[PDB]
Symmetry: C2
Subunit: 492 residues, 2 copies
């Protein structure tokens, strides 16, 4: 009769080593079924993306004897253990590793009779496609580009993108490396200033999946290089973000904001610490400094998994049956699965709890069908700052519950359109004339800005022998001004 | 001890061991150190997209003893098997699986000691993106539509996606399913016929 559990951690194992020992620390302390009957656990650490070390820390721990799993690992190691769970049928709860700055993207599953797997999609899965539908509904988009970081996988949210490609849309997609100031070093070289104009005008409706402090400094250098104003709409996408952290985003962000994360159904996190006569540490019962303002998934998975272990010791231990691993050699290919593991599957996989994410269950389809995101927008106030307020709320059972300019003139000296109101040396300051008023009525009845060049020829520019246009004409054909307002006898 | 190699064959394993065993017999006939000397093999025909079936063969081979590690298997059966052959010092000759009928984009390698990472990749990285960088510029097409079947990993155009994001191409990406008879139904019943005509143009 052993109560032993295990742990196999990859990548940043340090917070992985932290959360599971905290998950067993209050388990012989506050869980009431096995109270001071000690629960032991041999935390083992493998190298990032190495399934062979995971099998060495799994099947040895089987020989040591194990009962339950509180586990998260990545993409490449999970599918081999998925085919193991088709060939050995191991009870397991799964969270795929989030690379940070952008959300996790799902890793492809093997074809299987669903219900037995290593991967069950405990996390709220890829859903933001209909969230993508609401601004092309509301703000009626035509051109857009996703800014996703260097470690983002673009396969999950393809579902909006294909059908919207069937609606005559225009799209771009840009992967973003980490040194974002050096990203603009890579861009300002490749971008001319009129290309900076056309790309800021492409950048009036932003889409961002970016590394956090890099994304803050990206806000700052969009502000400094004036790529933004109170017309520029911004979409941020990451689940891994805290509640004051969005306030820390919007300090330099002064345009139209929209930030999505996985926000639960609305309920009070206070008095949830006292659940089932246990002392569950939470955001105000253990407000650990330097541990909440930056999110990771291991704390969302900390709350539910140990409450599932409290439901497990409540149900499975009191249902008159005992189960402890009679092991099998993973090196041998004639070792059938252990006989009572079908019980332990219900100890792990197909149980029933209602946590902070609502009900969490698994069945013979092995996915999470429903997701509730909350989709907020900006509120302008220069004193209390940007405070994101509810434009609508979203659910994956209905869709969205609710809804959501300076140009270069260029001058030619002319008799009727040009009359010098004031002159200075070399190049004068401001003329007058009729096309002044033509330029005026735009900027005074449309509410945007202007700049003014002067032509180097200024003599009703001509089709050159260079297959080219001089004067005012080719400046807009070399495309190095913006507007030309004159006596234009149009030819085809 | 034992004179033995291993093999795991997917997709049409009858084509795979037909190409395998005949060349094994020909080169066992023709090798100036292995003149009529039988290298033995244990071909494990496994189910489709079940790499653990290949892995339990390879750990069985470790409990057998082998010389090198030749295969044609999934990339999920390349990380564990490479770090399995790390300590026991076996060459990890890896051939990537087929995507399903699509052309292949090479799979990502995993975090490991690089240079000490000896998963011997017999299949090169995909370089059709070098061609497609040029084909949109030598025939000079800004508007077109790229299409695909559901058998491909849509990451595989990633630098072609970045250059097309910066080339100003406005190109639709559209899925095609397997039933081609239902394709025209799901076009025509869904599209308005003038919208159909817009997309025809």
């Amino acid at each position: 009769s052993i109560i032993h559990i295990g742990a196999i951690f990859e990548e940043n194992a340090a917070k992985d080593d932290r959360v599971f020992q905290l998950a067993v620390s209050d388990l012989s302390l506050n869980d009431d079924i096995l109270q001071s009957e000690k629960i032991t656990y041999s935390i083992k650490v493998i190298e990032a993306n190495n399934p062979f070390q995971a099998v060495q820390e799994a099947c040895d721990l089987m020989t040591q004897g194990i009962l339950a799993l509180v586990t998260s690992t990545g993409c490449a190691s999970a599918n081999a253990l998925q085919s193991l769970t088709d060939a050995m049928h191991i009870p397991h709860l799964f969270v795929q590793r989030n690379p940070g700055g952008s959300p996790r993207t799902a890793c492809h599953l093997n074809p299987s009779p669903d219900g037995e797997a290593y991967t069950l999609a405990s996390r709220p899965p890829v859903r933001l496609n209909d969230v993508m539908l609401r601004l092309v509904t509301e703000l009626r988009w035509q051109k857009f580009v996703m800014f996703y970081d260097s470690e983002y996988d673009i396969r999950g949210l393809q579902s909006f993108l294909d059908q919207a490609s069937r609606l005559g849309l225009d799209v771009s997609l840009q992967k973003v490396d980490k040194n974002i100031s050096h990203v603009f070093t890579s861009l300002f070289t490749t971008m001319k200033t009129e290309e900076l104009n056309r790309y800021r005008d492409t950048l009036r409706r932003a889409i961002l999946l970016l590394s956090p402090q890099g994304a803050h400094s990206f806000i700052n250098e969009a502000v400094e290089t004036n790529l933004a104003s109170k017309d520029s709409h911004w979409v941020f996408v990451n689940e891994e973000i805290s509640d004051p952290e969005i306030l820390d985003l919007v300090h330099s962000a002064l345009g139209r904001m929209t930030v999505v994360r996985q926000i639960f159904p609305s309920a009070k996190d206070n008095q949830k610490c006292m659940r089932n006569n246990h002392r569950i540490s939470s955001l105000l019962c253990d407000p650990q400094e330097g541990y909440l303002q930056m999110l990771q998934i291991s704390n969302l998975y900390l709350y539910d998994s140990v409450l599932m272990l409290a439901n497990a010791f409540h149900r499975k231990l009191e249902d008159r049956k005992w189960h402890s691993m009679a092991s099998l050699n993973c090196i041998r290919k004639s070792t059938k699965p252990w006989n009572g593991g079908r019980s332990m599957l219900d100890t792990i996989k197909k149980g029933h709890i209602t946590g902070l994410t609502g009900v969490m269950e698994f069945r013979e389809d092995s996915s999470n069908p429903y997701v509730q995101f909350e989709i907020l927008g900006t509120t302008y106030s220069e004193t209390f700052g940007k405070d994101m307020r509810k434009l609508a709320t979203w659910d994956s059972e209905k869709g969205l519950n609710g809804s959501l300019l300076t140009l270069k003139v260029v001058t030619v000296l002319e008799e009727p359109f040009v009359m010098v109101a004031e002159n200075i040396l070399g190049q004068p300051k401001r003329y007058k004339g009729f096309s002044i008023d033509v330029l005026d009525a735009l900027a005074k009845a449309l509410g945007f800005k202007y700049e003014i060049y002067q032509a180097p020829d200024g003599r009703y520019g001509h089709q050159l022998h260079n297959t080219s246009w001089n004067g005012m004409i080719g400046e807009l054909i070399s495309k190095r001004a913006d507007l030309a307002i004159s006596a234009i006898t149009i030819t085809p």
